[PDB]
């Protein structure tokens, strides 16, 4: 089919961009849990916008990112989906995740299972 | 506060070993501005642009600020830096600033030419602009380039040093300098002593003295010291040491350490600075609510 | 009859006349997460001037007894308040961690690399930096340190804590110098302290991210020779 090529030597700025990405994504993720462990909804618009400058930040160096930081993270308003609304299953569909903003993000779970993402098969991936 | 930062090194090429002779007149010299009156030092090194420029890291500076002349530091109370003016006529193959320039303190240079005034104004990165004032000017200094050049940076510098050499010269000084100061509208201007020797230094009152009688007035004179000699000073420490002008490895303490005035307390090696715990986030709050400092 | 006519160039033409005469509710907060930071920011401000009137009413100094005492008599004010001693070690060890990872300091210091560490932080993102203010234009801005919460283009915002006071700082970053220490993992041997200038980078984040930063004219840095 083609050339097997297998190169090892990351590179320092993607390296740069995505320990940037990663930082931004914890610290939001640890505001938001030390907020939400101890009381209720005190600063919830200050970690979201790490996020969105995070998501600014895929604008700029056009990296993706797996299907599990976007499926945590949402798709308008961009914040962290640790705590939703409401879960709802086989309401005449498939799956709904309501949020407080309304923006719901559904899954096709009713039409079969054993269906993975292109990241999660068994050879498409390699860590570190 | 003052600065002269055109101090000649008894050397124009690699090949050539300097004398013990011409160092001891170099501490000499340094003695003689540290007994007057003066504040800053850069001692200046003339390259060439067809010469064989060395593939080297630690060799391309023959300076030694460290062995020789921090110990004339600790009786001296004073700095140096080293700085390089590059003699370029024309665009010939040698380009290797990226080494030079980051080696270095401040980058100069001398042109001779036309084109080569062009390109160094455009595209070259340089500090300041020297002329050939022991010879004659190229063609024409005009207008609109030096002004959108001093407005991009770059400014122009007189060597007052330069007319105490021989008898003939100060013609084609003065002829020169009247022109660099008509057609650089009085901005970018900063004066520097290019002398070799104590024997041809001079003081504050004199020099001051001296532009006045060449053309520029007495104020713009001294805040052509205070301001703009200590701010292209400024400029190329942060572009060589730091990035380009962006985030510097400099502390910044009360009134003590400065990127220009603290150099010593700067590890030279590569770029830290080891400072100590000052900064707490623990108990710390206001500045004027503290009492421990 | 002189050729400065006043009233007649200006007044009384059709092409100066429009010149002056010479005669003469949870879900709309969070729509846009910008404003509702702005509401966040403003609402912090707002109730530390109410904690400021509160503890002058309370006449006690100590801070540790006016937080209990807002705790006892005021419980829908103490739900905006800041918690300065929470955000301290939520954020500090992070970014330490975060930049000895980053730029490569380990234990192993004599290998170290400072032009690839500087355009490293470039590079980085400041949002959760302990950073002072050690030289301004303003007197009165400096002696400030805090840590981010949020980056500006051209200001610049932290938090600091005084005897009583818990107020979102804001500092304008066109004519200032910045500092933050990075230490290293021994006891008292060895630090690191670095500096920025916010009046150099005048950029969002996103765009700091992609740009790659260029000489400017730098005329306007007198002061950091002047102080
Ligand atoms: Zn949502």
């Known amino acids: ?128 | 506060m003052l600065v002269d930062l055109n101090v000649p090194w008894p050397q124009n090429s690699y090949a050539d070993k300097v004398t013990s002779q011409a160092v001891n007149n170099l501490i000499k010299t340094l003695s003689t501005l540290h007994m007057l009156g003066y504040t800053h030092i850069a001692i200046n090194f003339t390259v060439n642009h067809s010469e064989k420029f060395p593939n080297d890291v630690k060799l391309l500076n023959p300076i030694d600020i460290k062995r020789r002349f921090g110990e004339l530091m600790d009786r001296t109370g004073l700095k140096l830096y080293s700085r390089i003016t590059l003699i370029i006529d024309d665009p010939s193959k040698g380009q290797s600033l990226s080494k030079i320039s980051q080696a270095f303190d401040i980058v100069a240079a001398l042109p001779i030419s036309e084109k080569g005034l062009t390109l160094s104004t455009t595209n070259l990165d340089i500090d300041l602009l020297t002329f050939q004032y022991g010879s004659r000017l190229p063609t024409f200094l005009k207008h609109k380039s030096i002004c959108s050049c001093v407005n991009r940076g770059v400014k122009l510098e007189i060597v007052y040093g330069y007319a105490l050499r021989d008898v003939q010269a100060r013609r084609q000084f003065v002829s020169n300098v009247r022109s660099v100061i008509r057609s650089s509208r009085s901005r970018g201007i900063v004066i520097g002593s290019g002398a070799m020797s104590p024997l041809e230094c001079r003081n504050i009152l004199g020099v001051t003295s001296l532009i006045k009688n060449l053309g520029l007035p007495s104020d713009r004179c001294s805040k052509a010291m205070g301001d703009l000699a200590s701010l292209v000073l400024l400029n190329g420490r942060l572009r060589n040491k730091s990035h380009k002008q962006t985030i510097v490895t400099g502390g910044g303490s009360g009134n003590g350490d400065d990127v220009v005035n603290d150099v010593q307390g700067i590890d030279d090696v590569q770029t830290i600075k080891v400072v100590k715990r000052s900064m707490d986030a623990e108990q710390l709050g206001h500045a004027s609510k503290r009492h421990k400092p | ?227």
């Not at chain 1, 407080?100 to 292109?118: E, H, L, M, Q, S």
């Not at chain 3, 340190?145 to 051209?154: C, F, R, T």
């Not at chain 3, 950029?203 to 992609?210: E, N, P």
């Open chain 3, 1 to 227: 009859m002189d050729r400065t006519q006043t009233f007649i160039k200006d007044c009384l033409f059709t092409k100066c006349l429009e010149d002056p005469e010479k005669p003469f509710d949870y879900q709309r907060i969070n729509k846009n997460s910008k404003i509702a930071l702005r509401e966040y920011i403003n609402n912090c401000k707002k109730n530390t001037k109410k904690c400021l009137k509160l503890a002058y009413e309370n006449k006690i100094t100590d801070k540790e007894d006016l937080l209990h005492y807002i705790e006892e008599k005021h419980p829908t004010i103490y739900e905006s308040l800041p918690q300065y001693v929470d955000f301290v070690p939520m954020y500090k060890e992070l970014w330490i961690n975060y930049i000895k990872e980053l730029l490569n300091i380990t234990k192993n210091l004599k290998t170290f690399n400072g032009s690839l560490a500087l355009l490293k932080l470039s590079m980085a993102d400041y949002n959760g930096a302990l950073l002072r203010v050690t030289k301004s234009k303003n007197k009165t801005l400096i002696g400030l340190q805090g840590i981010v919460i949020w980056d500006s283009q051209k200001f610049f915002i932290m938090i600091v804590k005084g005897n009583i006071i818990d107020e979102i700082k804001c500092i304008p970053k066109k004519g200032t110098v910045f500092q933050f220490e990075i230490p290293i993992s021994d006891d008292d041997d060895s630090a690191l302290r670095y500096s920025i200038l916010g009046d150099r980078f005048k950029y969002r984040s996103v765009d700091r991210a992609g740009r790659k930063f260029k000489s400017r004219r730098c005329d306007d840095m007198l002061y950091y020779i002047q102080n």
């Open chain 1, 1 to 128: 089919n083609g050339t097997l090529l297998v190169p090892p030597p990351r590179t320092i700025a993607n390296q740069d961009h995505f320990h940037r990405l990663n930082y931004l994504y914890q610290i939001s993720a640890y505001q938001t849990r030390a907020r939400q462990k101890a009381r209720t909804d005190a600063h919830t618009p200050l970690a979201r916008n790490y996020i969105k400058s995070m998501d600014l930040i895929s604008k700029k160096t056009k990296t993706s990112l797996l299907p599990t930081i976007k499926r945590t993270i949402c798709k308008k308003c961009h914040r962290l989906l640790w705590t939703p609304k409401k879960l709802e299953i086989t309401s005449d569909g498939a799956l709904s995740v309501m949020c407080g903003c309304g923006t719901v993000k559904r899954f096709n779970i009713g039409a079969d299972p054993n269906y993975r993402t292109y990241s999660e098969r068994e050879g498409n991936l390699l860590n570190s």
